[PDB]
Amino acid sequence: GHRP
Amino acid sequence: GHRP
Amino acid sequence: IEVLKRKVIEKVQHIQLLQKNVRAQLVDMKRLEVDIDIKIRSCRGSCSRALAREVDLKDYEDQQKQLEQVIAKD
Amino acid sequence: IEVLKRKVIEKVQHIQLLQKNVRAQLVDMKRLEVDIDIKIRSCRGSCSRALAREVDLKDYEDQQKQLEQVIAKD
Amino acid sequence: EASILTHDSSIRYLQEIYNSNNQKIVNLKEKVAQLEAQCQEPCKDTVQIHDITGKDCQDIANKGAKQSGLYFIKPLKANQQFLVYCEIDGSGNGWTVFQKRLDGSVDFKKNWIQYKEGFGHLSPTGTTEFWLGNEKIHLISTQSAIPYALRVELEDWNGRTSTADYAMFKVGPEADKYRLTYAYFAGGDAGDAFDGFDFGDDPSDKFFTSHNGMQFSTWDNDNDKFEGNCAEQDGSGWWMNKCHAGHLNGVYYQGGTYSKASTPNGYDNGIIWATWKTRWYSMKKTTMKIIPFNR
Amino acid sequence: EASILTHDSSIRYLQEIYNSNNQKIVNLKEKVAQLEAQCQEPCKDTVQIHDITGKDCQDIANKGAKQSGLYFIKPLKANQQFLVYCEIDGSGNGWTVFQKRLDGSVDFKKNWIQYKEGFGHLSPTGTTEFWLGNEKIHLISTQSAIPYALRVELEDWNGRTSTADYAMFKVGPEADKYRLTYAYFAGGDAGDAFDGFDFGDDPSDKFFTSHNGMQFSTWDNDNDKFEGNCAEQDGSGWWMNKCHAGHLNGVYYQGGTYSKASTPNGYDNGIIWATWKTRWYSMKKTTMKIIPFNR
Amino acid sequence: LYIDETVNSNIPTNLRVLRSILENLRSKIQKLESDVSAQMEYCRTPCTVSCNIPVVSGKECEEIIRKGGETSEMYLIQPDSSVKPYRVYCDMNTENGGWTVIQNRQDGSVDFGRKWDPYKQGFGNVATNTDGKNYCGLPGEYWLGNDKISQLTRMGPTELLIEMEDWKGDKVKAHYGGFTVQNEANKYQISVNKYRGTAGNALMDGASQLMGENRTMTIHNGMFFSTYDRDNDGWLTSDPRKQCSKEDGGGWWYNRCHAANPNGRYYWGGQYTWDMAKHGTDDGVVWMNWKGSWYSMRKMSMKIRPF
Amino acid sequence: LYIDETVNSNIPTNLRVLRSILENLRSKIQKLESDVSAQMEYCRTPCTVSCNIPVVSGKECEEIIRKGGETSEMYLIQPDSSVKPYRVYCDMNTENGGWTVIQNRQDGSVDFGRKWDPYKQGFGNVATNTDGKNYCGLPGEYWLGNDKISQLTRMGPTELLIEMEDWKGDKVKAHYGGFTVQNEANKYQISVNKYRGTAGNALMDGASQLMGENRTMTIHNGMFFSTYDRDNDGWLTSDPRKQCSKEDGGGWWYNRCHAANPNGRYYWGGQYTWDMAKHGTDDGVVWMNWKGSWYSMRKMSMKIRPF
Ligand SMILES: CC(=O)N[C@@H]1[C@@H](O)[C@H](O)[C@@H](CO)O[C@@H]1O
Ligand SMILES: CC(=O)N[C@@H]1[C@@H](O)[C@H](O)[C@@H](CO)O[C@@H]1O
Ligand SMILES: CC(=O)N[C@@H]1[C@@H](O)[C@H](O)[C@@H](CO)O[C@@H]1O
Ligand SMILES: CC(=O)N[C@@H]1[C@@H](O)[C@H](O)[C@@H](CO)O[C@@H]1O
Ligand SMILES: [Ca+2]
Ligand SMILES: [Ca+2]
Ligand SMILES: [Ca+2]
Ligand SMILES: [Ca+2]
């Protein structure tokens, strides 16, 4: 999971 | 020893 | 003009509503049944015995398309 | 004639009498000489040492053989 | 055409159950929540450990424990406290067990180290086989010299039982191997096996089959008064001499009776206690426990 | 002639004497009795026996005895009580001795029976050599299994002493000969000889020179693990194996040292204790005593 | 002008749908309310086990297999004398035993989306009884308490190993010769190194599919531990709804989320989608560096050893 | 006629001689005075011995030599468990050992003219230390107490043996296969038989020199024991001065006196006369049937055995  |  | 050329558009909100409210009201059932599946399962190692039951996932993706098959014909 | 004819054959009697007692003294004496020799010897077993002594009895034998050489004159 | 108020009777329905759904849903969410709530407990395990602690099982009994079960004792000159199975009678005596046989579930043909630290399992019911561990046993039996007592309790394949008591029981430090020593035989219908048995094959037997003063032996650590290796032969761990008169750590033989035929190297290796049954009968149940002699 | 009758007054003098004599002849008769009175008692004997009795010397100490000396013990399973020499320390321990060597006054090349019943003499001072008697020893060491301890105390020809302790000491009944057995070596600077010694002429030595488990042997009753006869050869009575590592009943050798030369059949027969001095040094003093192990 | 033929054929169809559906759900919901009101029924009674304890015990699984315990089952250790012995599962077969399990996933049996304290005290079933036998030779799903895991590592140079199995059957590993987890006071900060392995160093290097800045926010090394009530992820914002732990449904060293999320959600089958996740995030037993954000394993386990 | 010559010849010499001796005696009297006082002195200190006791012991000398004791010295027996062990001398050389001494005379060392109780308890020196050695291998003069002698015989069929040696050196014996002595209550009544021997059966047949009635009053068999204060001799009279024991100076089974009187008086040399005996009787270590009333032995001893 990645958040920009 | 005797004793007559 | 009156009888219906403007009294049916107030009805396109009566059709483009559910169609858009049920669309979402569907997804929630997916997110719900997926959830409850696990939830119930997690209970396998807590209670006496769980419940064997598969999730008819597919069926949702089915009714999921009949959704955008009626979203592109209005 | 008193102090002679009679009072002589009288003294003698009162003399023999005496001689008859020394013999008797040689008696138990001899015996005694012997009784002690023994009694002393018996000590060899109750005391430290026991006096080593000689009892030359002979002299007694001598003496009494002599004392009886005084009877043919009685 | 415009005579459509028969179509507005349908559209009504959809908003009906829909809002009935979007209700039933959220309501449900609430239950699932409550569901998760009562799904956060691990399975209930029947084995548990009484809270009380102490030097020996008896110390515990004294402290008020009443149920025979699993406890933690921390003997004087010892580091990390260890678990054990206490046996407590109505009278209030605290037996602390270092060995139990009863079904042959466990493989007693174990090595030196193993016998040092111990092996097998412990149950609160005391229905499991095990060997507490020489080292542990040592520590327990040796504290400011208060004397303990070894009670050997045997049960045949006919519910007949008997006991053997040993006063001033001790087990030496790994240094001097685990030499077992005892003051004297206290009593018991089981008979004094450790005192050696007159097997009858040779006079020397009784002398060679005594256990008092023997060092412990394991296939990997021969300390028996025997030319060869009793430990390896008979297949066990035990205070061997010219082998044994008492072999509680022997090979479990179902049925009780056995014979040369069934033995690896023609020698009686069963759980035997020569003074009670013959060398060819191997007890159904075995149990070695200790308790301060002042009891 | 009235002048020659001085006799009458002269005679009386001899007379006068007689009575003097008879007089003296009686004082004496008394005096003598005064002597016959003293010369009755026998001689005062220095050896005497304390009145207290018991099972073992320790029992006696307990009962209040304080002086080490000669006592009468009446062990449990025994018939006619027998005399023994107890050794009591300030602490109150009652050592009961079954063997003492110290000058070679006694001929230890005795026969079987002799060693059974015993021989030598007992003194209150404990300055005399002796062997209590296998049989007696047996009885003492075997009573409701209370364990005793054998303390071997050796003294060289240099006032140097040492000890050897043996736990759970027992001596078998004439039946199984007088087989000696012990739990283990308790300790002592004297070294554990009974455990056999590595003489060095052959590996088997240590094994062949151990004494635990050996039966007693006398020239007239060979029970040694030796082809020939150790008892006869070395000239003694003792628990032989392939002879010995410890031979306290050996041949007393003044000076302490000796050599093959001085020995009958080239074998060390001296009072030896291989683990302390060599096989060719024979202690000046030897003493084998026992005391309940709980001490 | 002519959009009057719809109220005849177009809508009496653009409406039949809603029926064929709102009729189905309305119905397909009762099934649920039903399954549940049932499971709740079952639960009136908990599951039971009886794990008789093995004699042998040490400071931890290693010492133990060294003390003779050679079967993989449940043992009782006591690393530090300052704390009382706790139960744990020892793997004495895989890679020369001595393995102390810290985390294990193999079925749905246990909820991992728990609060901070729970993760701190530990939870789950250490082991269940082997079919028949009287000892629990089978491990269960659990997470040995954080504090315990911390202390286990702060003892000496600890190595870590992570295994996982997909639904088809294949496996992979993730060795970390060095591994530590600070105490609670230090937000159980993780830290690893020496990556031997076939799964891809997620913990240290991050996802193998995210570039630059996007990957560095997937690295776990040095990250703090987060739970759905205690934020500590690399995600910094005022918005509370944005906390890797609330999403990704679990408790784990989150750093603006992850690259690998064990303790995630246990999706059956392995193949899962976003329109399936309670939060639309790739929550679930995932190790990106080997299957991507969209695949929850069938088995995932974190075991330690000293070295 | 002229007898007055004795007044001048005889008498004087009579008196002369007469004097001589009285003085002579007087001398001898003051001399004995001294010896007696001197001995009374050596006596301020008693004789000492140290008889370390031999390990071996039994019911009596027999059992003992049977238990291995092969040297003639002092042993410690205990015939009956009802009484404590007493010391006694065992003859293990003469006639195949096993001999328990009851009475022994070899020098003057011990007074035998004692009272009843003494004879009942016993007296004398059992044994003295052998020159140098630490054990009393040499016997002494003694009489093992009567009660002890009684009990020793009332145990089983006991045989008796009596030895004696004259001053010149020759010896003789007096075997009595059967021998017994009743308890004190029965005046230690003697009784014997089966006379093997060379001394002449004095105890049973009486003096070999007295005829008829005169001999039968010399037989000891069946007689009671008498001491100078307890009459029981065959002499019956009102006169108290007439009691074989007062005369014959000792304690022994008297029957109108004796034929053989051990325990008599120990006259040195052996040759003794009546005008030498305190009572003019043949008192002294005598065995008429071999040397006549006028000869006290140099050695006399009564030893027993079972048979
Ligand atoms: C490196 C690369 O391929 N670019 C993309 C970028 O366009 C996108 O906005 C971001 C999402 O957070 O992922 C990557 O960084
Ligand atoms: C065109 C491209 O590079 N792909 C995507 C882009 O479509 C998207 O709008 C962006 C969001 O941050 O991520 C990536 O850049
Ligand atoms: C034969 C003989 O020896 N004569 C004695 C005689 O001297 C003695 O006076 C008398 C009285 O005892 O007995 C005998 O007749
Ligand atoms: C010869 C003999 O020994 N018999 C004697 C006899 O002479 C005498 O009358 C008297 C002895 O004192 O009594 C005995 O009859
Ligand atoms: Ca061996
Ligand atoms: Ca032989
Ligand atoms: Ca955050
Ligand atoms: Ca009379």
mmCIF file with all atom_site columns, N, CA, C and O in Angstrom, chain D residues 19 26 29-30 33 35 41-42 45 47-49 51 53 59 63 66 70, chain H residues 14 17 24-25 28-29 32 39 42-43 45 47 108-109 125 265 275 278:
data_model
loop_
_atom_site.group_PDB
_atom_site.id
_atom_site.type_symbol
_atom_site.label_atom_id
_atom_site.label_alt_id
_atom_site.label_comp_id
_atom_site.label_asym_id
_atom_site.label_entity_id
_atom_site.label_seq_id
_atom_site.pdbx_PDB_ins_code
_atom_site.Cartn_x
_atom_site.Cartn_y
_atom_site.Cartn_z
_atom_site.occupancy
_atom_site.B_iso_or_equiv
_atom_site.pdbx_formal_charge
_atom_site.auth_seq_id
_atom_site.auth_comp_id
_atom_site.auth_asym_id
_atom_site.auth_atom_id
_atom_site.pdbx_PDB_model_num
ATOM 1   N N  . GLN D 1 19  ? 57.938 -75.911 134.085 1.00 0.00 ? 19  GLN D N  1
ATOM 2   C CA . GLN D 1 19  ? 58.568 -76.582 132.962 1.00 0.00 ? 19  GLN D CA 1
ATOM 3   C C  . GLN D 1 19  ? 57.499 -77.185 132.054 1.00 0.00 ? 19  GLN D C  1
ATOM 4   O O  . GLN D 1 19  ? 57.687 -77.283 130.844 1.00 0.00 ? 19  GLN D O  1
ATOM 5   N N  . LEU D 1 26  ? 56.356 -73.798 123.801 1.00 0.00 ? 26  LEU D N  1
ATOM 6   C CA . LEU D 1 26  ? 57.083 -74.155 122.595 1.00 0.00 ? 26  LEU D CA 1
ATOM 7   C C  . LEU D 1 26  ? 56.030 -74.665 121.648 1.00 0.00 ? 26  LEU D C  1
ATOM 8   O O  . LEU D 1 26  ? 56.152 -74.534 120.431 1.00 0.00 ? 26  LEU D O  1
ATOM 9   N N  . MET D 1 29  ? 53.951 -71.794 120.095 1.00 0.00 ? 29  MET D N  1
ATOM 10  C CA . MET D 1 29  ? 54.964 -70.928 119.463 1.00 0.00 ? 29  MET D CA 1
ATOM 11  C C  . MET D 1 29  ? 55.348 -71.551 118.132 1.00 0.00 ? 29  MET D C  1
ATOM 12  O O  . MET D 1 29  ? 55.139 -70.943 117.078 1.00 0.00 ? 29  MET D O  1
ATOM 13  N N  . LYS D 1 30  ? 55.918 -72.757 118.194 1.00 0.00 ? 30  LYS D N  1
ATOM 14  C CA . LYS D 1 30  ? 56.295 -73.506 117.000 1.00 0.00 ? 30  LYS D CA 1
ATOM 15  C C  . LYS D 1 30  ? 55.151 -73.337 116.000 1.00 0.00 ? 30  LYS D C  1
ATOM 16  O O  . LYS D 1 30  ? 55.338 -72.844 114.879 1.00 0.00 ? 30  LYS D O  1
ATOM 17  N N  . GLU D 1 33  ? 55.014 -69.793 114.712 1.00 0.00 ? 33  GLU D N  1
ATOM 18  C CA . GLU D 1 33  ? 56.106 -69.539 113.787 1.00 0.00 ? 33  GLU D CA 1
ATOM 19  C C  . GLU D 1 33  ? 55.602 -69.991 112.424 1.00 0.00 ? 33  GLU D C  1
ATOM 20  O O  . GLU D 1 33  ? 55.786 -69.311 111.415 1.00 0.00 ? 33  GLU D O  1
ATOM 21  N N  . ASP D 1 35  ? 52.220 -70.647 111.573 1.00 0.00 ? 35  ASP D N  1
ATOM 22  C CA . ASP D 1 35  ? 51.009 -69.956 111.161 1.00 0.00 ? 35  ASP D CA 1
ATOM 23  C C  . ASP D 1 35  ? 51.324 -68.627 110.463 1.00 0.00 ? 35  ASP D C  1
ATOM 24  O O  . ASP D 1 35  ? 50.697 -68.272 109.482 1.00 0.00 ? 35  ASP D O  1
ATOM 25  N N  . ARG D 1 41  ? 52.959 -65.684 103.679 1.00 0.00 ? 41  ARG D N  1
ATOM 26  C CA . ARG D 1 41  ? 53.008 -66.151 102.299 1.00 0.00 ? 41  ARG D CA 1
ATOM 27  C C  . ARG D 1 41  ? 51.715 -65.841 101.577 1.00 0.00 ? 41  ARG D C  1
ATOM 28  O O  . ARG D 1 41  ? 51.734 -65.379 100.448 1.00 0.00 ? 41  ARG D O  1
ATOM 29  N N  . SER D 1 42  ? 50.587 -66.083 102.226 1.00 0.00 ? 42  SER D N  1
ATOM 30  C CA . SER D 1 42  ? 49.307 -65.799 101.600 1.00 0.00 ? 42  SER D CA 1
ATOM 31  C C  . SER D 1 42  ? 49.224 -64.339 101.141 1.00 0.00 ? 42  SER D C  1
ATOM 32  O O  . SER D 1 42  ? 48.388 -63.988 100.308 1.00 0.00 ? 42  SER D O  1
ATOM 33  N N  . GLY D 1 45  ? 49.816 -62.688 97.352  1.00 0.00 ? 45  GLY D N  1
ATOM 34  C CA . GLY D 1 45  ? 48.760 -62.457 96.386  1.00 0.00 ? 45  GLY D CA 1
ATOM 35  C C  . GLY D 1 45  ? 47.805 -61.309 96.646  1.00 0.00 ? 45  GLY D C  1
ATOM 36  O O  . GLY D 1 45  ? 46.860 -61.113 95.881  1.00 0.00 ? 45  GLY D O  1
ATOM 37  N N  . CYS D 1 47  ? 49.152 -58.136 98.283  1.00 0.00 ? 47  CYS D N  1
ATOM 38  C CA . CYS D 1 47  ? 49.933 -56.907 98.396  1.00 0.00 ? 47  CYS D CA 1
ATOM 39  C C  . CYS D 1 47  ? 51.003 -56.749 97.298  1.00 0.00 ? 47  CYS D C  1
ATOM 40  O O  . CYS D 1 47  ? 51.090 -57.582 96.404  1.00 0.00 ? 47  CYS D O  1
ATOM 41  N N  . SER D 1 48  ? 51.805 -55.683 97.362  1.00 0.00 ? 48  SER D N  1
ATOM 42  C CA . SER D 1 48  ? 52.853 -55.422 96.360  1.00 0.00 ? 48  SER D CA 1
ATOM 43  C C  . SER D 1 48  ? 53.919 -56.510 96.318  1.00 0.00 ? 48  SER D C  1
ATOM 44  O O  . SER D 1 48  ? 54.076 -57.185 95.305  1.00 0.00 ? 48  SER D O  1
ATOM 45  N N  . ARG D 1 49  ? 54.678 -56.660 97.397  1.00 0.00 ? 49  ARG D N  1
ATOM 46  C CA . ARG D 1 49  ? 55.689 -57.710 97.458  1.00 0.00 ? 49  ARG D CA 1
ATOM 47  C C  . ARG D 1 49  ? 55.454 -58.503 98.741  1.00 0.00 ? 49  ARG D C  1
ATOM 48  O O  . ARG D 1 49  ? 54.729 -58.036 99.616  1.00 0.00 ? 49  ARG D O  1
ATOM 49  N N  . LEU D 1 51  ? 57.349 -60.441 101.925 1.00 0.00 ? 51  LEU D N  1
ATOM 50  C CA . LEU D 1 51  ? 58.600 -60.679 102.623 1.00 0.00 ? 51  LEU D CA 1
ATOM 51  C C  . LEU D 1 51  ? 59.180 -62.067 102.493 1.00 0.00 ? 51  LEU D C  1
ATOM 52  O O  . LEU D 1 51  ? 58.565 -63.059 102.887 1.00 0.00 ? 51  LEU D O  1
ATOM 53  N N  . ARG D 1 53  ? 61.208 -64.824 103.695 1.00 0.00 ? 53  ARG D N  1
ATOM 54  C CA . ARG D 1 53  ? 61.729 -65.224 104.999 1.00 0.00 ? 53  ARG D CA 1
ATOM 55  C C  . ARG D 1 53  ? 62.073 -66.688 105.203 1.00 0.00 ? 53  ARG D C  1
ATOM 56  O O  . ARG D 1 53  ? 61.580 -67.575 104.500 1.00 0.00 ? 53  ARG D O  1
ATOM 57  N N  . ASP D 1 59  ? 65.970 -75.203 115.381 1.00 0.00 ? 59  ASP D N  1
ATOM 58  C CA . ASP D 1 59  ? 66.155 -74.707 116.754 1.00 0.00 ? 59  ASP D CA 1
ATOM 59  C C  . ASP D 1 59  ? 65.024 -75.131 117.692 1.00 0.00 ? 59  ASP D C  1
ATOM 60  O O  . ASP D 1 59  ? 65.261 -75.545 118.830 1.00 0.00 ? 59  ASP D O  1
ATOM 61  N N  . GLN D 1 63  ? 65.573 -77.295 120.943 1.00 0.00 ? 63  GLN D N  1
ATOM 62  C CA . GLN D 1 63  ? 65.031 -76.847 122.214 1.00 0.00 ? 63  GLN D CA 1
ATOM 63  C C  . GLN D 1 63  ? 64.021 -77.773 122.875 1.00 0.00 ? 63  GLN D C  1
ATOM 64  O O  . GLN D 1 63  ? 64.118 -78.038 124.070 1.00 0.00 ? 63  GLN D O  1
ATOM 65  N N  . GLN D 1 66  ? 65.456 -81.042 124.028 1.00 0.00 ? 66  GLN D N  1
ATOM 66  C CA . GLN D 1 66  ? 66.179 -80.750 125.264 1.00 0.00 ? 66  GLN D CA 1
ATOM 67  C C  . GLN D 1 66  ? 65.257 -80.577 126.457 1.00 0.00 ? 66  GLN D C  1
ATOM 68  O O  . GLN D 1 66  ? 65.533 -81.074 127.541 1.00 0.00 ? 66  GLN D O  1
ATOM 69  N N  . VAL D 1 70  ? 64.355 -83.447 130.421 1.00 0.00 ? 70  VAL D N  1
ATOM 70  C CA . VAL D 1 70  ? 64.072 -82.946 131.759 1.00 0.00 ? 70  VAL D CA 1
ATOM 71  C C  . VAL D 1 70  ? 62.804 -83.644 132.283 1.00 0.00 ? 70  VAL D C  1
ATOM 72  O O  . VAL D 1 70  ? 61.841 -83.005 132.713 1.00 0.00 ? 70  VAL D O  1
ATOM 73  N N  . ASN H 2 14  ? 67.929 -77.147 135.933 1.00 0.00 ? 14  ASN H N  1
ATOM 74  C CA . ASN H 2 14  ? 66.578 -77.117 135.402 1.00 0.00 ? 14  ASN H CA 1
ATOM 75  C C  . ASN H 2 14  ? 66.279 -75.648 135.121 1.00 0.00 ? 14  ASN H C  1
ATOM 76  O O  . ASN H 2 14  ? 66.025 -75.262 133.982 1.00 0.00 ? 14  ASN H O  1
ATOM 77  N N  . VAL H 2 17  ? 68.450 -74.189 132.205 1.00 0.00 ? 17  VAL H N  1
ATOM 78  C CA . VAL H 2 17  ? 67.868 -74.534 130.913 1.00 0.00 ? 17  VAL H CA 1
ATOM 79  C C  . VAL H 2 17  ? 66.572 -73.742 130.777 1.00 0.00 ? 17  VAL H C  1
ATOM 80  O O  . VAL H 2 17  ? 66.450 -72.855 129.928 1.00 0.00 ? 17  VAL H O  1
ATOM 81  N N  . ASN H 2 24  ? 65.088 -67.386 124.757 1.00 0.00 ? 24  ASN H N  1
ATOM 82  C CA . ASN H 2 24  ? 65.136 -67.821 123.358 1.00 0.00 ? 24  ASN H CA 1
ATOM 83  C C  . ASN H 2 24  ? 63.773 -67.583 122.681 1.00 0.00 ? 24  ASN H C  1
ATOM 84  O O  . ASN H 2 24  ? 63.690 -66.947 121.622 1.00 0.00 ? 24  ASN H O  1
ATOM 85  N N  . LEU H 2 25  ? 62.709 -68.096 123.295 1.00 0.00 ? 25  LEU H N  1
ATOM 86  C CA . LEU H 2 25  ? 61.376 -67.899 122.761 1.00 0.00 ? 25  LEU H CA 1
ATOM 87  C C  . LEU H 2 25  ? 61.104 -66.414 122.706 1.00 0.00 ? 25  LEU H C  1
ATOM 88  O O  . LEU H 2 25  ? 60.753 -65.869 121.657 1.00 0.00 ? 25  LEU H O  1
ATOM 89  N N  . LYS H 2 28  ? 62.453 -65.073 119.654 1.00 0.00 ? 28  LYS H N  1
ATOM 90  C CA . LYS H 2 28  ? 61.635 -65.446 118.514 1.00 0.00 ? 28  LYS H CA 1
ATOM 91  C C  . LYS H 2 28  ? 60.318 -64.683 118.462 1.00 0.00 ? 28  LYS H C  1
ATOM 92  O O  . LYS H 2 28  ? 59.813 -64.382 117.384 1.00 0.00 ? 28  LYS H O  1
ATOM 93  N N  . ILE H 2 29  ? 59.765 -64.359 119.621 1.00 0.00 ? 29  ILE H N  1
ATOM 94  C CA . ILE H 2 29  ? 58.519 -63.627 119.639 1.00 0.00 ? 29  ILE H CA 1
ATOM 95  C C  . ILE H 2 29  ? 58.702 -62.193 119.153 1.00 0.00 ? 29  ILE H C  1
ATOM 96  O O  . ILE H 2 29  ? 57.925 -61.711 118.328 1.00 0.00 ? 29  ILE H O  1
ATOM 97  N N  . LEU H 2 32  ? 59.147 -62.354 115.260 1.00 0.00 ? 32  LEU H N  1
ATOM 98  C CA . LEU H 2 32  ? 57.937 -62.502 114.467 1.00 0.00 ? 32  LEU H CA 1
ATOM 99  C C  . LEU H 2 32  ? 57.182 -61.177 114.479 1.00 0.00 ? 32  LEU H C  1
ATOM 100 O O  . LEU H 2 32  ? 56.542 -60.799 113.498 1.00 0.00 ? 32  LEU H O  1
ATOM 101 N N  . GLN H 2 39  ? 55.550 -56.899 106.812 1.00 0.00 ? 39  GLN H N  1
ATOM 102 C CA . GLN H 2 39  ? 54.628 -57.325 105.765 1.00 0.00 ? 39  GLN H CA 1
ATOM 103 C C  . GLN H 2 39  ? 53.383 -56.452 105.761 1.00 0.00 ? 39  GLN H C  1
ATOM 104 O O  . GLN H 2 39  ? 52.826 -56.135 104.705 1.00 0.00 ? 39  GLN H O  1
ATOM 105 N N  . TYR H 2 42  ? 54.586 -53.683 103.479 1.00 0.00 ? 42  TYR H N  1
ATOM 106 C CA . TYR H 2 42  ? 54.681 -53.886 102.033 1.00 0.00 ? 42  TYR H CA 1
ATOM 107 C C  . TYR H 2 42  ? 53.262 -53.802 101.505 1.00 0.00 ? 42  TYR H C  1
ATOM 108 O O  . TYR H 2 42  ? 53.039 -53.483 100.339 1.00 0.00 ? 42  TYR H O  1
ATOM 109 N N  . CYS H 2 43  ? 52.306 -54.078 102.385 1.00 0.00 ? 43  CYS H N  1
ATOM 110 C CA . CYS H 2 43  ? 50.897 -54.068 102.030 1.00 0.00 ? 43  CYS H CA 1
ATOM 111 C C  . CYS H 2 43  ? 50.184 -52.731 101.843 1.00 0.00 ? 43  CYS H C  1
ATOM 112 O O  . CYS H 2 43  ? 49.027 -52.704 101.413 1.00 0.00 ? 43  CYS H O  1
ATOM 113 N N  . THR H 2 45  ? 50.424 -51.067 99.686  1.00 0.00 ? 45  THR H N  1
ATOM 114 C CA . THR H 2 45  ? 50.187 -51.103 98.247  1.00 0.00 ? 45  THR H CA 1
ATOM 115 C C  . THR H 2 45  ? 49.877 -52.535 97.807  1.00 0.00 ? 45  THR H C  1
ATOM 116 O O  . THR H 2 45  ? 50.630 -53.457 98.096  1.00 0.00 ? 45  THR H O  1
ATOM 117 N N  . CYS H 2 47  ? 49.023 -55.778 95.029  1.00 0.00 ? 47  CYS H N  1
ATOM 118 C CA . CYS H 2 47  ? 49.667 -56.285 93.815  1.00 0.00 ? 47  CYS H CA 1
ATOM 119 C C  . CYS H 2 47  ? 48.770 -55.915 92.642  1.00 0.00 ? 47  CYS H C  1
ATOM 120 O O  . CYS H 2 47  ? 47.547 -55.903 92.778  1.00 0.00 ? 47  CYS H O  1
ATOM 121 N N  . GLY H 2 108 ? 51.888 -70.069 97.896  1.00 0.00 ? 108 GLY H N  1
ATOM 122 C CA . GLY H 2 108 ? 51.095 -69.685 99.051  1.00 0.00 ? 108 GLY H CA 1
ATOM 123 C C  . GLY H 2 108 ? 50.249 -68.446 98.843  1.00 0.00 ? 108 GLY H C  1
ATOM 124 O O  . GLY H 2 108 ? 49.428 -68.091 99.686  1.00 0.00 ? 108 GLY H O  1
ATOM 125 N N  . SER H 2 109 ? 50.444 -67.812 97.696  1.00 0.00 ? 109 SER H N  1
ATOM 126 C CA . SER H 2 109 ? 49.782 -66.574 97.344  1.00 0.00 ? 109 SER H CA 1
ATOM 127 C C  . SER H 2 109 ? 48.369 -66.278 97.847  1.00 0.00 ? 109 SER H C  1
ATOM 128 O O  . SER H 2 109 ? 48.014 -65.105 97.957  1.00 0.00 ? 109 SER H O  1
ATOM 129 N N  . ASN H 2 125 ? 43.134 -64.911 92.781  1.00 0.00 ? 125 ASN H N  1
ATOM 130 C CA . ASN H 2 125 ? 43.549 -64.260 91.560  1.00 0.00 ? 125 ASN H CA 1
ATOM 131 C C  . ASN H 2 125 ? 43.376 -65.261 90.442  1.00 0.00 ? 125 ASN H C  1
ATOM 132 O O  . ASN H 2 125 ? 44.046 -66.304 90.416  1.00 0.00 ? 125 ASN H O  1
ATOM 133 N N  . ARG H 2 265 ? 45.651 -76.045 103.900 1.00 0.00 ? 265 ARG H N  1
ATOM 134 C CA . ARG H 2 265 ? 46.696 -75.104 104.245 1.00 0.00 ? 265 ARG H CA 1
ATOM 135 C C  . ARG H 2 265 ? 47.872 -75.423 103.322 1.00 0.00 ? 265 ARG H C  1
ATOM 136 O O  . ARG H 2 265 ? 48.155 -76.595 103.053 1.00 0.00 ? 265 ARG H O  1
ATOM 137 N N  . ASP H 2 275 ? 52.491 -81.346 115.354 1.00 0.00 ? 275 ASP H N  1
ATOM 138 C CA . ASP H 2 275 ? 52.966 -80.319 116.278 1.00 0.00 ? 275 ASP H CA 1
ATOM 139 C C  . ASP H 2 275 ? 53.385 -79.089 115.498 1.00 0.00 ? 275 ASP H C  1
ATOM 140 O O  . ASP H 2 275 ? 54.254 -78.329 115.926 1.00 0.00 ? 275 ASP H O  1
ATOM 141 N N  . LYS H 2 278 ? 48.096 -75.531 113.354 1.00 0.00 ? 278 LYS H N  1
ATOM 142 C CA . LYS H 2 278 ? 47.365 -74.686 114.283 1.00 0.00 ? 278 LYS H CA 1
ATOM 143 C C  . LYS H 2 278 ? 46.396 -75.461 115.153 1.00 0.00 ? 278 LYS H C  1
ATOM 144 O O  . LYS H 2 278 ? 46.127 -75.044 116.275 1.00 0.00 ? 278 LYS H O  1
#
